[model samples]
Target: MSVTLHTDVGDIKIEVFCERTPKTCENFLALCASNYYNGCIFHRNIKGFMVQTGDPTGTGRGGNSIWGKKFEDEYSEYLKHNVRGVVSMANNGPNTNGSQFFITYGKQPHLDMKYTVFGKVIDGLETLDELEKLPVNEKTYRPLNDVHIKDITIHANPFA
Candidate 1:
């Protein structure tokens, strides 16, 4: 299944792995179907690492969810953090996923098994670069220029 995040820079199409991360995909699709990401901004961004977002508060609170509820972590040994443009859930610990995720701009094998790797960027990965290249504040690290999530469209909605 696939979902596309249309940002100000461009469109990022991600192929969600249902078989590997079923619950995570459903959680994401539910948010997308409800148009939860519309108008949300990328809350946290690191230039060479990963860009993070999906917080309704956009303050990196590490709480809240697409369904207005928190969810448990979903894991699959088959999934690994092997490359850039990989999409994974963000959490405080195991089984605490909310409406937060990050896409890597560089290799982060250290993240393997520590986060849920539910999806992979299949197209328009350069958008990550476009967002990352911008300057951000040192304190909060939010983009000085907003990188808004204009909308999310589910083209092959399999979960949720």
Candidate 2:
């Protein structure tokens, strides 16, 4: 399964780990098909770490599932957060995922088994880099210039 993130700078194509992480893929795809991620901004971006978005308010303070509630975490050791372009859900704690997500910019082995790895960026690595390279507020890690998500198109039968 694949998804296209149409961002302000460029588009990112992601291959989802549906077989390895089914629930995570389902939730992300449900949100995508429902247009829940449209117009969301990449709010929390840390240099050499990751770029996070999916917060509707673009402040890293808002998001909710298409179900209008939180969802449980789905982890698979087979789906490890082991390199750049790893995409995963952002949660406050364990199993607290809503709509927030992140894309890694480097090998973040420390995050293995911590965040739910849902997908991998198959294309647009430069676009992910472009998001990470955006100037951020030194204190909050928020980009000084907002990077918006124009749309998200899913190329998968999430219902299946």
Candidate 3:
């Protein structure tokens, strides 16, 4: 299904590729349907690398209560490591992903086939870029301004 993530920065529309990553897609869709990501923040943003969030605590290391309840990663060799706006799961190790996900700031060819690519941001790439450029602490590089996700809505159209 297609999902719209409404954030303080902007709205990101993504088409979840269920066929490619069934478990990951279904889990994410369920989270969206249940409002699991509401009031969450994109806690991690690294310029020229990636922007990560989905943890309720607005911390890169944390996640929702649903964390670790989902299935394993379904890696895809066909999914290209494209430019910004590509959405993929975050994992401490293989098949350990939870609610944490990230949007690449640039092409991440090395990450291809390593992480599950469940969706792509069809809109709001510029807004994502703006969020990626926020000022951060020099040492930890934590964003000074939080990028909050107000709400997320799942669309009926699967291919949206």
Candidate 4:
């Protein structure tokens, strides 16, 4: 139910919503298990919004689902982007969930039902704030310094 993403700044412990979003959890957990998120960077960081990552290329344009290049969206009214630390899949459009994801820094109700919210930060809130403080390019939102993900450690496997 929980996974700790070891990043350069700090560890981000997240609670995966397996019961609410089974398919999303499966893909995320499987990717973590396979070390697919290792050495990745938080390529997109928007102040007071969210931090985006999971692209091996260290670019927002990459990464894919365990199923393939992309997967369908898993929506849950119970899981809203109404608070900070909400974790959701990042996509180009509908049913485009991939390995990319974001963690909100504030209420993002505008994103409700649009992005798949599958988890939340259970710990390391300070870490999230630290990431938010990093200097980023105003246009590209790329951090001045790379926020590398050392790895992800899953504490529980829903399907296993």
Best by TM-score: 4
Tens-place lDDT per residue, model 3, 65-154, is 254564588888767668778899988777777888988888999988788888888987878877887898767667887768888877
| Candidate 3 vs. true structure, TM-score | 0.91
Q: Each model's TM-score? A: 0.92, 0.94, 0.91, 0.96
Runs of candidate 3 with Cα error greater than 4 angstroms are: 64-70, 158-160
Compute the lDDT for candidate 2.
0.88
Model 3 has an lDDT value of 0.81
Highest lDDT: give the candidate number.
Answer: 4
Higher-lDDT candidate of 1 and 4: 4
What are the lDDT scores of the predictions, listed in order?
0.85, 0.88, 0.81, 0.93
TM-score (C-alpha) between model 4 and the true structure = 0.96
Kindly list the per-residue Cα lDDT of model 2 for residues 1-160, writing each as its tens digit: 8999999999999999889878788889998988989989988899888889999888776898877888888888788777889999998888888889999998898888889999999999889878877998999999898789999887856587
Query: Cα deviation in Å at residue 152, candidate 2?
Result: 1.4
Q: Is candidate 3 or candidate 4 better by lDDT?
A: 4
Q: Number of clashing residue pairs in every model?
A: 1, 0, 0, 0
Rank by lDDT, highest first. Answer: 4, 2, 1, 3
- Greater TM-score among 1 and 2 belongs to 2
lDDT value, residue 108 of candidate 1? 87
Q: Which stretches of candidate 1 lie over 4 Å from their true place?
A: 157-160
